[PDB]
């Protein structure tokens, strides 16, 4: 049973860069009929995988020309000749020459770009939520880069969540949620801000 | 729309896949899963003409795969569920006699997000985030996921729906926002609890 070692498992590159991913099969996956059943799949967040390349080198219909694959025997490559923002995704190779079929473990692509300062908003607890005995106060860091930011409100009582990179800006957004009991019922550090902004 | 179930550790889950007459004649049907944040993992498949199937060794003793000719539905049942089987399970297809065609993943949206946990089901409450940026706080549900929409899918640009975070209580919470400079409504639904709400944001 064939193992497909895919590499790298993750990388950071910019718009314009060449990206080069390899899948190594633990044995020859060339079928006795002379064909090689290796496809390359693209999984944007958060959707279904789509086919880009099939049987090593075939560009699936409608796929842009900057994608390609080659290789042979046990050594296979997937190339994006010049990366774009909408190419942020996890890529996978898929071999179906002989069962059991197998995917590579995936190459998660992350895109670097210019520093953008987050525009920030704060929201007090809901009208309706105060009747419940709890208060959630929420802070939104919007459309920024890189993802490292510091938000202080308090400590041990807020949580954050960050969006996947935007397929157009390659920016992120972030939430900090303060929860306290009602009641009872936001300052940001970021490389794009020459000075910490309080909301 | 995809399914969503929670199952207790040790139990089994059985998932179905609706396909067509043409799929059962012309493609191999196979089951894939994808844990949260992780990679695609091949479970096994069946040739629905032949009835012969094939498995990943990892699932050899704890998975069965079957296929019903007359209703063209295909099945997978995973037993002895462990926390690490928490995944999205979905079925998928490859031509028996033609090349890969880009239609392999058309049943993905039919799949089921399976959570293996002893926690129970709970619908969320949806609170407005009043203004710029407005939104909805979706708090206190289990399991994942919830689906959020603005204006029934009219609105799209500038929307950010954050990944859920497990709160200290063992329950999930998230927020969904949008920037604008017209009336704005939240569409939140959580299938495991048959919650389907619509909040007006003022």
Could you give the topology of this structure?
The complex is a heterodimer of chains A (about 200) and B (about 200).
Chain A: E1 4-7, E2 10-14, E3 19-25, E4 38-43, E5 50-54, E6 58-59, E7 67-72, E8 75-80, E9 90-95, E10 102-103, E11 107-112, E12 119-123, H1 127-130, E13 134-144, E14 150-152, E15 158-162, E16 172-181, E17 187-189, E18 197-198
Parallel strand pairs in A: 2-11
Antiparallel strand pairs in A: 1-3, 3-8, 4-5, 4-9, 5-6, 7-8, 9-10, 9-11, 12-13, 13-16, 14-17, 15-16, 17-18
Chain B: E1 3-7, E2 13-18, H1 21-26, E3 27-34, E4 40-46, E5 53-55, E6 63-68, E7 73-78, E8 87-95, E9 112-116, E10 125-129, E11 133-141, E12 147-150, E13 159-161, E14 165-166, E15 172-179, E16 184-190, E17 195-201
Parallel strand pairs in B: 1-9
Antiparallel strand pairs in B: 2-7, 3-4, 3-8, 4-5, 6-7, 8-9, 10-11, 11-15, 12-16, 13-15, 14-15, 16-17
End-to-end Cα distance of chain A: 57 Å
Q: How many discrete domains of chain A?
A: 2
Based on the coordinates given, report the CATH architecture of the largest domain in chain A: Sandwich
By DSSP, the count of extended strands of chain B is 17
Percent in helix of chain A: under 10%
Domain module tally of chain B:
2
CATH class of the largest domain in chain A: Mainly Beta
Largest beta-sheet details of chain A: 7 strands, mixed
Q: At the third CATH level, what is the topology name of the largest domain in chain B?
A: Immunoglobulin-like
Q: Largest sheet of chain B, if any? A: 6 strands, mixed
CATH H-level name of the largest domain in chain B... which superfamily? Immunoglobulins
Shape of chain B: globular
- The CATH architecture of the largest domain in chain B would be Sandwich
Number of strands of chain A: 18
Report the structural category of chain B.
Answer: mainly beta
Kindly, what is the distance between the CA atoms of the first and last residues of chain B, rounded to a whole number of angstroms?
Answer: 29 Å
Q: Name the helicity range of chain B.
A: under 10%
In CATH, the homologous superfamily of the largest domain in chain A goes by the name Immunoglobulins
Largest sheet strand order of chain B = 1-9-8-3-4-5
Topology order of chain A in helix (H) and strand (E) letters: EEEEEEEEEEEEHEEEEEE
PDB class: immune system, antitumor protein
Keywords: Immunoglobulin fold, Displaced strictly conserved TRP 103 following Kabat numbering, immune system, antitumor protein
Assembly: dimeric
Entry title: Crystal structure of the Fab fragment of Nimotuzumab. An anti-epidermal growth factor receptor antibody
């Amino acid at each position: 049973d064939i193992q497909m070692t895919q590499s790298p498992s993750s990388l950071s590159a910019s718009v314009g860069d060449r990206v080069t991913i390899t899948c190594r099969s633990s044995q020859n996956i060339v079928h006795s009929n002379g064909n090689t059943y290796l496809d390359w799949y693209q999984q944007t967040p958060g959707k279904a995988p789509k086919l880009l390349i099939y049987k090593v080198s075939n560009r699936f219909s409608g796929v842009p020309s900057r994608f390609s694959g080659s290789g042979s025997g046990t050594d296979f490559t997937f190339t994006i000749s010049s990366l774009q923002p909408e190419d942020i995704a996890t890529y996978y190779c898929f071999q179906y020459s002989h069962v059991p079929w197998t995917f590579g473990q995936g190459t998660k692509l992350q895109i670097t770009r210019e520093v953008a300062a987050p525009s920030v908003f704060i929201f007090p607890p809901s009208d309706e939520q105060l009747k419940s005995g709890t208060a959630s106060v929420v802070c939104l860091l919007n459309n920024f880069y890189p993802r490292e930011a510091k938000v202080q409100w308090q400590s041990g009582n807020s949580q954050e969540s960050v969006t996947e990179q935007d397929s157009k800006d390659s920016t992120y957004s972030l939430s900090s949620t303060l929860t306290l009991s009602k009641a009872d019922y936001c300052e940001v550090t970021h490389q794009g801000l020459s000075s910490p902004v309080t909301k | 729309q995809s399914g969503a179930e929670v199952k207790k550790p040790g139990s089994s889950v059985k998932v179905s896949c609706k396909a067509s007459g043409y799929t059962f004649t012309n493609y191999y049907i196979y089951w894939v899963r994808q844990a949260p944040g992780q990679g695609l993992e091949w479970i096994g498949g069946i040739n629905p003409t032949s009835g012969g199937s094939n498995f990943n060794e990892k699932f050899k003793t704890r998975v069965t795969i079957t296929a019903d000719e007359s209703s063209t539905t295909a099945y997978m049942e995973l037993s002895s569920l462990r926390s690490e089987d928490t995944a999205f399970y979905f079925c998928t297809r490859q031509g028996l006699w033609f090349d890969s065609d880009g239609r392999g993943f058309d049943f993905w949206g039919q799949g089921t997000t399976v959570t293996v946990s002893s926690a129970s089901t709970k619908g969320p409450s949806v609170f407005p985030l009043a203004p710029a940026a407005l939104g909805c706080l979706v708090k206190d549900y289990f399991p994942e996921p919830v689906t959020v929409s603005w204006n029934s899918g009219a609105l799209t640009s500038g929307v950010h729906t954050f990944p859920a975070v497990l709160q200290s209580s063992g329950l999930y919470s998230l927020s969904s926002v949008v920037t604008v400079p017209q009336t704005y409504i939240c569409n939140v639904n959580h299938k495991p609890s048959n919650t389907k709400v619509d909040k007006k944001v003022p």
